[PDB]
Design a protein around this ligand. Structure first.
Ligand SMILES: NC(=O)c1cccnc1
Ligand SMILES: [Ca+2]
Length: 223
């Protein structure tokens, strides 16, 4: 996250870190045994880390649980990033409390104008690299589809939305991928892609979660 703020320990209780010996992507806990993240984050051998603030220090509220199954969306296209969403089932159910909690799926799509919270342990610089050890947060509005499409001609599908600032300076970035975009207490987006980070006229692009609720529910019910 570029241009954000330190969230505070366990203030974003649904945020997870995907670990393969190191943090590589974010995710969101949607129930005691399932996590949603971006398909481009797919890897074998994932350990899901819940209850994290500092990812390099054991602070006392962590739960580390191995994934038992990963399901990439059936129509994921790695070249266009269309349908950038995947589900991860945990080997065992997480213990749910004030600091480890699920986030609700939306029943309606959010509108441009709506303010959302984006979070992650990704790069904090637009030029150069600095990875934080503690969770960073950013409040950003959903942008109109027209401004989104104008910023990225020929690249925005019906399964994506833009959020952020056209002036720049504030955005998600590498390492935040797979993480949550939460608006009005619902999961509306997944950190997906963006041309550099926090660049003028190049806002972040997020997977539209409201288009996938039926898929998510059906998949969970049978796996
Ligand atoms: N610019 C961005 O928001 C972004 C997000 C994820 C990966 N790369 C860039
Ligand atoms: Ca920790």
């Amino acid at each position: 996250i570029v241009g954000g703020y330190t969230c505070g320990a366990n203030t974003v209780p649904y945020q997870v870190s995907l670990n393969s010996g190191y943090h590589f992507c974010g995710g969101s806990l949607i129930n005691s045994q399932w996590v949603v993240s971006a398909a481009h984050c797919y890897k074998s051998g994932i350990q899901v880390r819940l209850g994290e603030d500092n990812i390099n220090v054991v602070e006392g509220n962590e739960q580390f649980i191995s994934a038992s199954k990963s399901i990439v969306h059936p129509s994921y296209n790695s070249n266009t990033l269309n349908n950038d969403i995947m589900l991860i089932k945990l080997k065992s159910a997480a213990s749910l409390n004030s600091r480890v909690a699920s986030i609700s799926l939306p029943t309606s799509c959010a509108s441009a104008g709506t303010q959302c919270l984006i979070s992650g342990w990704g790069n904090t610089k637009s030029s150069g690299t600095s990875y934080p050890d503690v969770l960073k947060c950013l409040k950003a509005p959903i942008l109109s589809d027209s401004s989104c499409k104008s910023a990225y001609p020929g690249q925005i599908t019906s399964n994506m939305f833009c959020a952020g600032y056209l002036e720049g300076g504030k955005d998600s970035c590498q390492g935040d991928s797979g993480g949550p975009v939460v608006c009005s207490g619902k999961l509306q987006g997944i950190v997906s892609w963006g041309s550099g980070c926090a660049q003028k006229n190049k806002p972040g692009v997020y997977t539209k979660v409201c288009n996938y609720v039926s898929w998510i529910k059906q998949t969970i019910a049978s796996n």
